Design a protein around this ligand. Sequence first.
Ligand SMILES: [Co+2]
Ligand SMILES: [Co+2]
Ligand SMILES: [Fe+2]
Ligand SMILES: [Fe+2]
Lengths: 329, 329
Amino acid sequence: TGDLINTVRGPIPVSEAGFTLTHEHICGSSAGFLRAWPEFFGSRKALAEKAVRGLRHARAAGVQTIVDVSTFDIGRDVRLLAEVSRAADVHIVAATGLWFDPPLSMRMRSVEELTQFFLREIQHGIEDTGIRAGIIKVATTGKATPFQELVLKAAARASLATGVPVTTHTSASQRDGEQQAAIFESEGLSPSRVCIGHSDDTDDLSYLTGLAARGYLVGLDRMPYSAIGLEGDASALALFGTRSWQTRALLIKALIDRGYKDRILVSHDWLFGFSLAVTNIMDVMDRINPDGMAFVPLRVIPFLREKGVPPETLAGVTVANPARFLSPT
Amino acid sequence: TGDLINTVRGPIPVSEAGFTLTHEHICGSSAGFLRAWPEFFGSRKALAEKAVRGLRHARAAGVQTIVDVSTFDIGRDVRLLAEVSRAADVHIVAATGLWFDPPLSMRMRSVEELTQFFLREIQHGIEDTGIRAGIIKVATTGKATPFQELVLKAAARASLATGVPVTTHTSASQRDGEQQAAIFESEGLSPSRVCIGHSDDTDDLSYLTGLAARGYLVGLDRMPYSAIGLEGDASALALFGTRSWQTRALLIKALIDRGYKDRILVSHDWLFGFSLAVTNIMDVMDRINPDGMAFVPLRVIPFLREKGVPPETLAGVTVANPARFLSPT
Ligand SMILES: [Co+2]
Ligand SMILES: [Co+2]
Ligand SMILES: [Fe+2]
Ligand SMILES: [Fe+2]
């Protein structure tokens, strides 16, 4: 009680976050895209409605909070987030940082400047809204680019200054987490303030246990993603992989079995709109996982219980871990 | 009389465009950047004020219209343009198209989709404003990327459908114009609807005359840009070049001397804010060219007259050529 986290509708007690999905999206897009070309999504109204329906479904399944890790370059639209959050009655935590699609205007900035931008979004508010970011999202896709190194350093600096956690995108097969950790540690950031994302994209437990042993959160955040049965579709295969949801889920058990229950964060990396991919992908995704953001509570959690994970352990993963991670520290 | 062109404040008679700068920017930025981080520019208010001052200065020097060729990916802000246009009493023509910094959400689109986006901006309006684009801006930086080819084709298609002209960014030293022309012609676009930009960045008149002979407009649009005296500054050298304004200006005479007066368009490619470059560049630019967008009327035109170009020829370049180019055809 009494620690607070910022959401798109304002501050909430940490204890109110409850069952929380720590890596999600309302819309995966680009800065200004939804504004310039809402028809891409049928309409802004249609997108919002679809999002409210999905969130209501998640809520019925027990989800109380989502962390929307859409950055400026993922086309994050805080007004949209606030609208859908209110209508679905689900908390949404907004993000700052930068993903792997930064425009030149960001790419040309110094580490000091980036830090100031991240700080603005956390401390003051996003755009002209007063809506403050509750998390910092950063990314590599293999070995960090020089700009990416700066971005990670700025993220560490903003976090140390505000207590807001850092969360990442990785090319998990390339073990990006090791480099990301090295950079964060070089800045003095505690591993406990950091989640190494898309970790379920790999079955290399040496890599994963290695991070966990050091105190990192391991983000198992792509639970619904599989191209199994549609390798006909090349975009889907590259995007979704050939591993099943069960294989991904088994990683959660694997880590618990290895003593790392307190270090796990679980999510879908789902969305309700998606312009970051060729046009048909959203439909394909909807066909594969109609449960959307209810998939983890509906399918993953019962799978785990059936494999013998205790309910209290599962509560700790879905409730306690997100609460510790989010609470500014 | 009676042909109309769209501006940020609405429709105007073509005959009212008058002395027109066909390649300009209020702000060279990125989509959503000015919204997310106005402090980068001191403030939105400060940027607008600086722009009004520069435009008023241009207006006093005789400029009546500018074409702001900032695309979605140049962070074009139509509301800003409209605000400054009204306050400075200078017409501004807005653009659609895409520059060389497109985000993934654009990169992932088909030629058909891009065409629909360009058409939306021309026919319906930009974002939710009702402000319609009067031009299409496209870009290559050397050999066209595959996406760039699609963008050029969509631009040709939108132009044929609406009559709005197409204007380009080139790496002039690499002779991009030849390839851009080939693609436009493959789509059936008339060369008269096309301006091949940044053509003053090269002294290869074989290249330039070649375009002109085919009926292309040659955009001599970087008149004030030189790093002479500041090769100490590496960013400035790469950006500005080592050729003087006089050398650039001589190209205008060169083309007139070769029979191509009707094929020339002249501009500054100036701006009042600039986040697309490292932070100090705007200041450096202001120091070199305090006249801003008044530089062409103040310095270039008198230089030309002094080298014997007749006033009526100069009027034709600065008034008649832009009018023919802009008038939807
Ligand atoms: Co990601
Ligand atoms: Co250019
Ligand atoms: Fe994501
Ligand atoms: Fe330009």
